[PDB]
């Protein structure tokens, strides 16, 4: 497995040039996980500071997203962001499944290895579903929720995520009015470099929508095991994907919990909203830090 | 009032009392008098039922529950001002947020306790408006096809909400709400019984105004709305059986997974191959799905 | 007679835009002088009643949109103190705080309006708090506009402003009015302007009776309340927003950035449906 | 081990005046760094507990007249901050406001300090009020100068001189204008600010000084925990406070008052007159009966 970290580390100089550090600063580290090796973003106070954070992101994106959270708060706060196997840096194994239900045992890997403790999860898209697996099991070492246009229910009724999953493709490109097109053509040829090579993945993603509806009812059947870790609810509002119909389902399900709606905002709430979701970020910690 | 209430009676029955076999009772209220359904034991019935309807929909509606459930249990079944043959008053504003206070003030006078509630469509809402703040009083919920949240960003609900807003005045002169928006809530065509689908359209005939608001409410009442889901833990621990219509395209899943997720005393019925008026669509076979459910509230 | 009076006056005060202020104008002869008010709204009352009270140099004009988008379901009263707006303006009235107090509780018993929502803006803030303070079971809630309740003769802030010589506050202190409105306010600024230039001194000269709602603060502290605030206005700054979100159990505070001191005119009818957000919460307390 | 160190420096703070600082140098190796303390009175513990936390750029030495007078029969217990007096000053630690909670919450476990009454100055209210908001039940009352618990990043006082001292640090720290020249105007008469402490507090900040520049900084950019405070008000609000406030401070003006004022249920103020913000340097022992007023109340 030791031999898998080489493999990473020898494309991050054979292959790796192109990731624009100006922009992603952060050093760069992997871990052979028995399934494959991950890399990872661990950056912070050398402390571990007030807090553990780790970001977990969505299909087709990668840790590239959450780089405006990581540069602004590693100065008091661990940031840890995971790019998905198949994804980013890391490993592209022909050996797995790429479904969301072994997606979510490399997260609980990942942070068993790295012995991450009362950790605050932020989730976008997938990354809700493949972290509110930990917080569904392991809801003593999860410290809050930050949740981003993102579920947690089998929707195999609602036609809309059926016509998204069943319709003809290689996989999920970016773009399924404040402006025409709502990244940075800087950004937007970062995450396609990322989706270069092995692509399985981003296609993998939108068939298990309806193919893992058994894994999501057996989030959604013990979700009274979360409905007590204090979360914020932060909201692309003119996302397509995730109506206010998701958004008020959260509002729900969550005793001890805060919501801000972005309007003009869309999917990729990180990008597009960008620095400014850092003090919403923030002001969460800092209430999570009261224990 | 007086002369208003022997009025409602005495030119009552177009309808097929052999469907509607129930006695027509009258109440005078403060903004107009309200005609209702109350079927049951003579004896206090095992449970206490009231049962309120959607749009155009009145107590016909539930007319399967009462037949059924009277048997055992008292069954309340109420026409808003408007609706069924209610008073059709000149100053009430049809407001669903003024529904229940009628609603309210409707209760107090027949005195109910432990009640359990029948929600459909705006009747959810009008009556989660009074377990919400009567909530110790309020036994059990039977929801089917509704909602207790402002959508007023979502644009489902906003195209519907604002093409019946134009239509309004139009749809007021011909009554499309009866002939066009009862017919495709249906999952089949066909069960929408003629008998049924006429007497519907008989009943919302003289002034119909109350018709045409609830379709505007659906955007123009999100600051009662609102209220209701901001105060929404006052409901979340009393049971619930949800019973939807999986046909519904009003009232997508996505709306039933917020009460799954509201309720925690609940569990829920998809009827695939059933649309928004499940009263009507599913009739009698509805009715073992109440008794499954007031046998466990009685049984506490 | 009094009211009389007022009758002739305002028939000859065709200078109202009544475009925008349609209201039936409303006279009573109350024991200091006659007030003018609007009383607007559903022949049932209403689902609720407000009562809302205007500041310096403005008058009820201020509350035209709560009036116009409101009226439908409840019942808006809004009152000219006098020597403002179309209300008379007697040579015999002290025109200062603690005594336009007492004609706003002898107005509400006069008109006997029962669990009102008091709308208060600048010194209506203080007058209604008054009533609020000693008869706390005949209010349904408040809603709070760029204002005050306490002494501040300590504070150069406050002190300077009242300490500053003028005949009276202008309005304004490039330009946040249509000048519609402007002239609608200055025109009732015509005549008689003396209680305009009571009030700015007062903000002094009736520390005591700031102190006496101060200190007995606790009798409005758990009444529910809507704070909506001019985040620009220099007058009353975050430093008081902070004190009444402090004071309240029960509220909520809506920050308008952007927006300065006259939050009815600068806000608009965007104001609306933050009031019947709260009207519809203060409506399941009774 | 680092607290000898510590020690070692004391083996070379002669500079301190013990005439007017008779009390004994204590020192507690916390996690983050090792923190100077002051533990003094009655032999076993006094009729009630003190710790005192101080502002910037002052230290215990601030307290200097309280513990003189009260260690008679209460225990007063007094600390500086990593980066201030003799406290040690940490290469890897942020200085932040809401870190330095976190190191007095690990001192007063350690300490097991129980019951406590809270003095607070400045920066010392919300590094205190982080403690007592969220271990009310561990605390007696709240003697409070000069200070906030809220988030002010909107009110363009507090911004203006954070935003100056924001630009300023780099020579601010170089030259130490937060001791020859912030402190001064925090002073009604210059006169009472003597000679002698103004040394003091100038050679207890000498060295790296960081902690001192960064203060002024997170009046802004610590917004963020003073809003997780300020949004949790209510957990302190039954607690007893006493408040002295001097009225000729700028920089917290009774427009602040005013809102501690409205927060505690029993609460009773002093309105220092022709006094400035330091308070207990200006106003000296004629501070102590104030506190020792509280502190006989407090004891039920």
Known sequence: SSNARDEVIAAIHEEA???????????????????????????????????????????????????????????????????????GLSERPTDFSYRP????????????????????????????????????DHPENVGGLVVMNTWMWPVSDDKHFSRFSKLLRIGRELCEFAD???????????????????????????????????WLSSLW?????????????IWGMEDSAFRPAELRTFEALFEDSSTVRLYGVGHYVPEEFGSDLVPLVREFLEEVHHH
């Open 17 to 87: 040039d192109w990731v624009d550090r100006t922009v992603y600063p952060f050093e760069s580290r992997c871990i052979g996980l028995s399934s494959g090796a991950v890399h990872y973003i661990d950056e912070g106070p050398d402390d571990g500071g007030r807090e553990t954070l780790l970001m977990l992101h969505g299909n087709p994106t990668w840790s590239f997203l959450y780089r405006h959270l990581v540069r602004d708060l590693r100065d008091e706060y661990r940031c840890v962001a995971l790019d998905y196997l198949g994804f």
């Open 101 to 136: 239900e072994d997606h979510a045992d490399v997260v609980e890997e990942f942070i068993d290895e790295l012995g991450l403790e009362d950790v605050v999860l932020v989730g976008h898209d997938w990354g809700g579903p493949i972290g509110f697996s930990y917080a569904i």
């Open 221 to 233: 059947e013990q979700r009274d095991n979360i409905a007590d870790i204090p979360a914020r609810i």
């Open 180 to 214: 025409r097109s709502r990244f940075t053509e800087s950004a937007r040829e970062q995450y396609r470099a990322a989706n270069r090579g092995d692509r399985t993945g981003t296609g993998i993603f939108p068939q298990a929508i309806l193919g893992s509806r058994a």
